[PDB]
């Protein structure tokens, strides 16, 4: 069980750690988060009280280094940093733990939600989507745009999601125009899975990471990418059976975790009604269809 200590909390802020969150008041004696489960990526995110504009945060894996948070009063945010001095870190954490100034990662033992939302997400792939190679952790915020978005403006601050475009030469073989547009299996299986992602685990990892950025940061281009990767599977007549079963589990937990009062902006009516009711895979997502119909029947 690992720890992300805080130097201090000089400004009042809601702090998220994965699917949890808690309020910290200005200059409250708060010195971070303990008992973080090892084996999963994590995100720690921030919404200042004064400016609910800009949710931001840091994807990290405590196996990759000792990380702490320190507010920067110049740039005006809570920044993640790595401590290279291992004994300085242990000693600081130990003191904060002795004075009980850390909140405990509040994982219920029956609860596999986080695992289920991050099953295929790996830091190494996150870092290729979020290029900032001098750090072991990755910064994301609400306003960052995606590479595909920029083709339609700062390259360094972009989300490098895999570009998916159904009306593109990559997606449509010369001479198979109708076939490939109405049945995207070629594009799913050969172009993307075999060509680009290499396997379905990497595909599902990007899809899960896009959902998490949409949900935690309201990042619009991430939400576009999540829906695009769902629609490409659902619009393919030929999908490995194991991928269909897993997709159903993946979306089930995403739908289960979504805040009830964010569904209107985070869920695309057209995509979901098509996937659940018109697409090739309309009969293959039993768990997702049941939770969607019981929780958001208005969207449909």
């Amino acid at each position: 069980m690992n720890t992300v200590p805080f130097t201090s909390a000089p400004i009042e802020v809601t702090i998220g750690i994965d699917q949890y969150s808690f309020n910290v008041k200005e200059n409250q004696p708060f010195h971070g988060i303990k008992d973080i489960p090892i084996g999963h990526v994590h995100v720690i995110h921030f919404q200042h009280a004064d400016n609910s504009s800009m949710r931001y945060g840091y994807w990290f894996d405590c196996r990759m280094g000792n990380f702490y948070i320190q507010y920067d009063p110049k740039d005006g945010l809570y920044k993640m940093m790595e401590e290279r001095d291992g004994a300085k870190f242990e000693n600081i954490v130990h003191n904060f733990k002795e004075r009980q100034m850390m909140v405990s990662y509040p994982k219920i033992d029956e609860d596999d939600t986080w695992y289920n939302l991050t099953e295929f997400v790996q830091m190494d792939k996150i870092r290729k989507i979020v290029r900032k190679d001098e750090n072991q952790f990755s910064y994301v915020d609400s306003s960052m745009t995606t590479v595909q978005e920029n083709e339609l403006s700062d390259p360094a601050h972009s989300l490098n999601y895999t570009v998916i475009n159904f009306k593109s030469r990559e997606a449509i073989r010369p001479g198979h125009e109708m076939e490939d547009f109405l049945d995207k299996s070629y594009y799913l299986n050969t172009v993307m899975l075999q060509g680009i992602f290499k396997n379905s685990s990497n595909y599902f990892g990007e899809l899960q990471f896009a959902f998490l950025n949409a949900m935690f940061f309201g990042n619009y281009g991430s939400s576009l990418q999540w829906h695009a990767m769902i629609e490409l599977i659902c619009s393919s007549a030929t999908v490995p059976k194991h991928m269909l079963d897993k997709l159903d589990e993946i979306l089930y937990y995403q739908i289960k975790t979504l805040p009830e009062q964010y569904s209107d902006i985070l869920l695309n009516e057209r995509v979901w009604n098509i996937c659940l009711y018109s697409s090739f895979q309309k009969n293959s997502l039993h768990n997702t269809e049941k939770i969607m119909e019981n929780k958001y029947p208005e969207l449909l």
Binding site: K167, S168, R169, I172, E177, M178, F181
Partner: protein, 237 residues
């Protein structure tokens, strides 16, 4: 964006453009079977591809053999249209290729866009207008060439005959649309108007009669009356 009343004069400017209408591509007759069920029998169609500035009509005849053994024909028909429109542009030298293609039905947009991915500088546009191009099969010579075709075939027509010698392309296009609207609203009356007078002929190579200017005004007025009338006889007004 969409072509509508507000940007109608763009059709007569010097950017090459084509209208594409697919309403006659997939044509059937519906009949009873011996068992009392219903079946369709396809008949020959055509794609109506028209340069509204010049009058050039690239009439691609869709022979019934293209539907043999295929499923979802109304959907195929849109993609067949798009495939045929794309090889026409490819066939054309660059300076003769369109800058825009306007489809008369919105369901043609994605089929044509996908088949034209190789031509990113050709804009595919819908229209808000309710153009009467479906009535092209009420022009006898066009109907005759479609029905007689025994194989796929491209037949070239100037749908303005020689009118551009005397009127502008704005006026020609407005004449054409009026004739086609009339034919679409009451084909029998429309045709009586055009061919009542035995002395006015259709010279072999033209589609419409050789009206004088004054005679075209009489005709044009008689077609407007027909269209107001049938609107009454339909709406009781």
């Amino acid at each position: 964006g969409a072509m509508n009343s507000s940007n109608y004069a763009e059709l007569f400017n010097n950017d090459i453009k084509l209208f594409v209408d697919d309403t006659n591509v997939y044509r059937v007759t519906v009949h009873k079977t011996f068992e009392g069920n219903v079946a369709t029998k396809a008949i020959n169609g055509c794609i109506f591809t028209l340069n509204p500035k010049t009058g050039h009509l690239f009439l691609k005849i869709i022979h019934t053999s293209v539907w043999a053994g295929q499923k979802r024909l109304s959907q195929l028909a849109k993609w067949k249209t798009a495939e045929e429109v794309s090889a026409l542009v490819r066939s054309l030298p660059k300076e003769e290729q369109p800058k825009q293609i306007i489809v008369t039905r919105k369901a043609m947009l994605d089929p044509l866009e996908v088949h034209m991915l190789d031509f990113p500088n050709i804009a595919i546009r819908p229209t808000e207008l309710r153009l009467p191009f479906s009535a092209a099969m009420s022009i006898d010579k066009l109907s005759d060439v479609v029905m007689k075709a025994t194989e796929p075939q491209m037949v070239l027509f100037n749908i303005y005959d020689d009118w551009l010698d005397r009127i502008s392309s704005y006026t020609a296009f407005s004449r054409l649309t009026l004739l086609l609207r009339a034919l679409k609203t009451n084909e029998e009356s429309a045709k009586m108007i055009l061919l009542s007078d035995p002395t006015i002929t259709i010279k072999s190579y033209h589609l419409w009669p050789s009206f004088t200017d004054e005679q075209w005004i009489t005709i044009e007025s008689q077609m407007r009356d027909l269209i107001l009338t049938e609107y009454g006889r339909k709406y009781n007004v």
